Amino acid sequence: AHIEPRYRQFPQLTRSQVIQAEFFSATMWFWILWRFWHDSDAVLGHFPYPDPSQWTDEELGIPPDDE
Amino acid sequence: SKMELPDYKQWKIEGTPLETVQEKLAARGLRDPWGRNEAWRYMGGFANNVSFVGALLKGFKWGFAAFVVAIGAEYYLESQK
Amino acid sequence: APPLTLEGIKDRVLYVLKLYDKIDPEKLSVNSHFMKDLGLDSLDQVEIIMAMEDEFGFEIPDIDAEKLMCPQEIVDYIADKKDVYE
Amino acid sequence: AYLTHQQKVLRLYKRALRHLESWCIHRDKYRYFACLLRARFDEHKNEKDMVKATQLLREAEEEFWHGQHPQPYIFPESPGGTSYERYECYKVPEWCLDDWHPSEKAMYPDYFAKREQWKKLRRESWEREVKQLQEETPVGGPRTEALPPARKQGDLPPLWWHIVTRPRERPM
Amino acid sequence: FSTSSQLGLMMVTIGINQPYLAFLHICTHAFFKAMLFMCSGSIIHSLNDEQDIRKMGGLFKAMPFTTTALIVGSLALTGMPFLTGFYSKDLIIEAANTSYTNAWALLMTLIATSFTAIYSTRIIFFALLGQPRFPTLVNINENNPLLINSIKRLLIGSLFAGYIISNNIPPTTIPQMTMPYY
């Protein structure tokens, strides 16, 4: 019909399928790239995780050993 | 016949992975007699297929171009506003 | 899938045989016996059937395959299964 | 088994190659091993001791069973394939056309005129076909399921209707 | 089998007492899974009812639009950052491993997540990459507007639907957003 079959050879293509495929593949990568720039915390973490050993006995209210 | 078959002389194993198989069988005294029947899969538009990373990166060239423009377009407006 | 024809089946059946190194593409004709004329043996006949199976995308049972001894017989067998009457 | 030793080896060869093709996948890889496998069969092709040849076959079968692909490739329309019997629900027997209402038969005046000729041909040939089988079947009944060809001109091969008139493989 | 795997992940989410995450995964999974099955149908139709991947290959350029949707679908399924599947799967895993839960259940959910990448590569690698392994009579055609439009709409959903839904639904939990980098 509009695409005649072939024998042992690469098939015939239309422009629209190639253009549309390329456009939507780029749209995926623009969307992924754009989101990193704005939402990099969704992948790396929004807030720092404190190191629990860097807290002083004063902060946590640990009294000295003798009393 | 509407259909036409490509000339059968053109199907050759040379320069394709089918050739490499021939030397290996040659070192053993064997030959592969169907090699030409497989040749078409390695020739013409079926040669040089992308790799896995190449496939996953399809569209990266222009998606990146649009992203660089878009952030620059955003970079302008923030500076003004 | 696009329909087949008797001449189309014969063209492709020989096409596959012409890409087999144990057959002389000049001595080949639709009526060449793979055993008497082309000099092939039982083991080569099996591989020919497998090549035709891969060509047309359907299996020929061993009970039927062993009797196909010339290219015309293969052509006739395929047409019967595909209901080709051209 | 009804199969001769020669038939058994060939069926194993075809079976072995197909399962080898499932393992390799890539055609270049399959070609390399297919030639090595053909070499193994060619090595003992001229063995003349039918006790050794029979042993070689039995061992080969055991090796195939250990090395077979658990999920071998099947042609889509072969038994077990994904399209096997897919179209049987579209195959309608030809005798169903006899029950069509006249108004249904009126839409194909030319097909149903040709159909009558075939039915006439079937009616006229039947008696000869029965006679041919009777006078060719050895006393006691047939020994094989093979049927004869027609001998005279104007005779049709015995028992032909359900072979000639069977549904197409793509009936709809 | 991917769907059964994903349904298990939804059931895990039920188990860790995250009913709404399980629901969001139902909605997001609906887009790219239905697209993968339609992308597979496009291949099966073009290869004359062939379904075995061993007899495919070399379709990356022969079927460009099917290829694009199949990569987007596989990336969405595997949880590529910021595609439809990321906005549910990524949240679920963080909730699971910052929860009071069975350690074996957690480990088996992480290993299965790794397996999701493995069998997604399997479809992409064997269907699209390499040299063609199908029969000689080439009938590859994917230019029907009905095929293109139907997959095109699901492709757009597979990109933005997760983003659109995740930003419009009201919050009904306290999402745990403080945890070690690892």
Add this chain to the structure above:
Amino acid sequence: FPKYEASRLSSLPTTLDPAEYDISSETRKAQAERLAIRSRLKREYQLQYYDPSRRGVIEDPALVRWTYARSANIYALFGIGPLVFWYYVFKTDRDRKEKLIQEGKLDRTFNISY
């Protein structure tokens, strides 16, 4: 290679069966005899199946024998055994439940459908 081990639900492959090999003049004469019976029955069926004027059913005596043999033996998991087992399960269950209700220890706060 580890030998094939055959179960009831997983039969032995023909290619792995010693009987299939070692052809004997008697086994072939047995195989040739079975084929004769099958061909005799095939001819009997075909002479009615292909008859132009036959409209109906080709009654198969093999199918008549099969249904007749299956429907005849009209009269564990088929005696007092299963009944007694289930009698004590429900009697035991309902006795405990009745005791709890009488002792007010069974919660039926909103039970008003029965």
Add this chain to the structure above:
Amino acid sequence: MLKYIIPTIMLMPLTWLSKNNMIWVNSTAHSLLISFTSLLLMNQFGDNSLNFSLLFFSDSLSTPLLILTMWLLPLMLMASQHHLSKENLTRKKLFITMLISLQLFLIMTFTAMELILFYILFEATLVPTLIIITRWGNQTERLNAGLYFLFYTLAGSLPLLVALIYIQNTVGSLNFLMLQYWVQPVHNSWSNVFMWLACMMAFMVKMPLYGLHLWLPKAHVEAPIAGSMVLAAVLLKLGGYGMLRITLILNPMTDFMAYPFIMLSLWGMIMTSSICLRQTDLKSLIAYSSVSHMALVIVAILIQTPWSYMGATALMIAHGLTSSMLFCLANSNYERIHSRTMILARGLQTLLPLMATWWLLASLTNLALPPTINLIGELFVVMSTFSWSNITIILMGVNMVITALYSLYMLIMTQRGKYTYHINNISPSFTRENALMSLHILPLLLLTLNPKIILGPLY
């Protein structure tokens, strides 16, 4: 009830005085009008039943059975007139007379206010049924099927007669309305144990209870289609109706006498469903299906809860229409291939596409697809039986799994697959056959829109 009894008797003169070629037209036309007027029985009240006179009354339990009974007569004439087409004219009229006399006894059975009147009419149904089976059955074994049916029933009925006459002697009345106010509790004693068994074992045989069920597959396999329709649709329900009325005067002894019969029904339903998976005869499969479905009704009647009586009522109506439909569907095949073997004629959906839709609809109701009344009835029994003992949910749940398996297996075996090559006489479905199935399935599905009228007096 004379507004229904007299018209039903008038079907006899109408048939006998009809012109030769009009017996089937006239009887069917006027039996449908009687079925139309039967809807006036649905003037039911919340508190009081509809008590016409000293002889007959109607309540919410007998009304749906009465409407089912009168709807079935026109359907049996449609189902019958084909295989009787070559019958002698007089013998056609006698066959129709037997069906009319069966409706007459049945509508009086369900409305009799006196239990001994109920017994006489209850036991009178035997005569027309036995005659239909043995005279118009087509096989040798119809004679043995007649005797088994006859002597299974009388074995239980004769003890029942003694028990009823004993009860009237000591209570003074067997009027059902009177027995509601004068009933006294039944205390534990060997004498009262056997009074309980006599009062119930006649009804258990007609249900039939598992163990006493072996007469039913025999009768079905040998009966003509009309005999199978009435037997499955209505006659089995006589036992259920009798048990719903007689259990009033058996309390509280039914608390412990029910146990053996609940065990037979709970286990019996699982085994009969499993047997249906291996049946080779189509009519025999449907017969064993009824035993499985009627075992639910026995369990429901015996546990005596408001939900179990509503469920049992719905089950009897729903199973009546479904089982009758299935028998007619298997008969339509039999009239073509003249065999009852289920595996003989396969792949019929290809050759009879619309008849394959009727098969699908009938199978779905048999497996009780929501919201059909088949499920509603089945569900209510499950809900109440769960309260009776939670463990029963396992047996109830398993039975639904097996019931699905053989219902669809019967659909797949006969309608799907490849057609049988040598069977070439599958003529297109007749308008008579299509109308017959639609008259089963449409009313069955319509009742989902208003199921209260089939939920009995405890609704």
Add this chain to the structure above:
Amino acid sequence: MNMFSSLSLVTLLLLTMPIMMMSFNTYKPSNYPLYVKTAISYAFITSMIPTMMFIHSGQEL
């Protein structure tokens, strides 16, 4: 609630009319698949109006 409740039901009622026309046979089998496809596409739009109301004011009924 009038627009919310009304439109959330027409979505469900709209999916059934193609079923009613086939069963009632007053349709046109010339392009039934397109008719069924069109019905979904409209039912999707009518179902967005209730959804936006929920997104906006959390409405549920």
Add this chain to the structure above:
Amino acid sequence: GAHLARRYLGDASVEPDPLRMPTFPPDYGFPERKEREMVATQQEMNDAQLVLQQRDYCAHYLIRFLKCKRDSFPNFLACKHERHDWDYCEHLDYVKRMKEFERERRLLQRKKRREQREADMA
């Protein structure tokens, strides 16, 4: 985390039990602890129909976000700041719970040393 390795594979008596803690009084070692303040009243959380699990010590930030979400419709990308404010509060609330676990751990360390010191000196 490492805390599991220490507890299960190491010494369990000096690692907090997540189901039972705190196992020490709130004041032990704290001179005058201030009680946490709850900005949102019970009625405000009731009228807002907050999910019960969301009715914690950050509920006032959640209410503000939900109100801004309703008012900015259809702009579903509004409320950037309000959402972050609520998220950040929930982080500090989680960090406070992290401190509780560490305090509980360190007190147990102190206890065992106390028991050891009053053991060897017995």
Add this chain to the structure above:
Amino acid sequence: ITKDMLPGPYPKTPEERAAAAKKYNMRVEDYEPYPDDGTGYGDYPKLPDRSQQERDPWYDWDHPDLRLNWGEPMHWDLDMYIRNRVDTSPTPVNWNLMCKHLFGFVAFMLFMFWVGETYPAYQPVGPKQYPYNNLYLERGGDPNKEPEPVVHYEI
């Protein structure tokens, strides 16, 4: 069919075996009745318990779906062995090994789900704190009683 062509009682003598085999269209050597023990088989042949799936798919059967020929003796349990039901065809793995590996996988998984329950994962965090006495009133607490207050402190 005539009564002489229907099944009968268990054969006793070589001639009662010879006649039974002929009735069933079998070789007398291949004919074997079910062992006599009152179960009710009669003289019906005992055919190999093999599924219909195991028969040749390419042979031209009279019934292609059932893979049966017209007139051959049907297995007693044929309805159990149709292609829709029980299958007995050989497996690429041994039956016993399949059972060992499948059970072992399930038994091992259940063991490690128990170990996971005994040693759960969790984060180093104190219990979540809720205002207003653990939300006493919101969780349906009766207001007339005054609950013991739950007090939370800063840190």
Add this chain to the structure above:
Amino acid sequence: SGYTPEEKLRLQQLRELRRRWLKDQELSPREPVLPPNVIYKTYRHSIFAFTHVLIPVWIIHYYLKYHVTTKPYTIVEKKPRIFPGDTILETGEVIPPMKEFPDQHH
């Protein structure tokens, strides 16, 4: 191996008949003998909108407005969420704001 001359001959004969049969399945030109851009698309979707949306919603609205909502507890709404600073339309009441925040920030 191959076909025997009788096997070959029979296939030749059935082949001639089969191909003639298949040729006879073709339809003649007259068969079957049946008995006796945006503007168009816009109309086609105008009718569908009217018949499949407007008429149903008219019926539903009449049903819900005048038969369903006139009965108690037929349609039940989750009551609207009220936030600090809101104003009730029914009673004109103003909801107080929340108290001053401690004002941690980052």
